[PDB]
Amino acid sequence: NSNICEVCNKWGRLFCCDTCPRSFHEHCHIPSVEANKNPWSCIFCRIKTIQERCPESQSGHQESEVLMRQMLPEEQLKCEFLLLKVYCDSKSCFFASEPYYNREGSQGPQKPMWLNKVKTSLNEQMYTRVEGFVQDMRLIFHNHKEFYREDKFTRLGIQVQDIFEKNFRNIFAIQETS
Numbered sequence: 001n002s003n004i005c006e007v008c009n010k011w012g013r014l015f016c017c018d019t020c021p022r023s024f025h026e027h028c029h030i031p032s033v034e035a036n037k038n039p040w041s042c043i044f045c046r047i048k049t050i051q052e053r054c055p056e057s058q059s060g061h062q063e064s065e066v067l068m069r070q071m072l073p074e075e076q077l078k079c080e081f082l083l084l085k086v087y088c089d090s091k092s093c094f095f096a097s098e099p100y101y102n103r104e105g106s107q108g109p110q111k112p113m114w115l116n117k118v119k120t121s122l123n124e125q126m127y128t129r130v131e132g133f134v135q136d137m138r139l140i141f142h143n144h145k146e147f148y149r150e151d152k153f154t155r156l157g158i159q160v161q162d163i164f165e166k167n168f169r170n171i172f173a174i175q176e177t178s
């Protein structure tokens, strides 16, 4: 096994995957690492099994069809993984916790959103369809773009959104386009 957490790249109290070399802090893994379960398999491994069980799940899909899917267990899992892939970039620190807004010349967003709120929402099964989760994720970056305006800090939102969007297309096997 690895000696650092796969998500935040730090040592500490790590739980080790039994089917791959990855390790995790308790609250870095999504869902939070399960109390018992020996052996234990991480979210990377559980996502690989889904693909291996239904190879055709990797044929191309339309985004509009993906978004309307109900949050059954396998879609729940894929959204948790996509969220985890965003937390794996260090720039996610800017979007993790509840923001506040007091900048000369700007007004705060009507609907604030942050990664830990989306985490809790997933955890509490508040999304009924994929669309619910993707809308909140995209709103995080859209709020940041609007508030920071021409400050070069807006770029952090573009960068972390690109990580989200690349992973969304991968995880949900979105049809490749020019």
Ligand SMILES: [Zn+2]
Pocket: 005, 006, 007, 008, 009, 010, 024, 025, 028
């Ligand atoms: Zn960690």
Ligand SMILES: [Zn+2]
Pocket: 017, 018, 019, 020, 021, 022, 041, 042, 043, 044, 045
């Ligand atoms: Zn694993």
Ligand SMILES: [Zn+2]
Pocket: 053, 054, 055
């Ligand atoms: Zn099959």
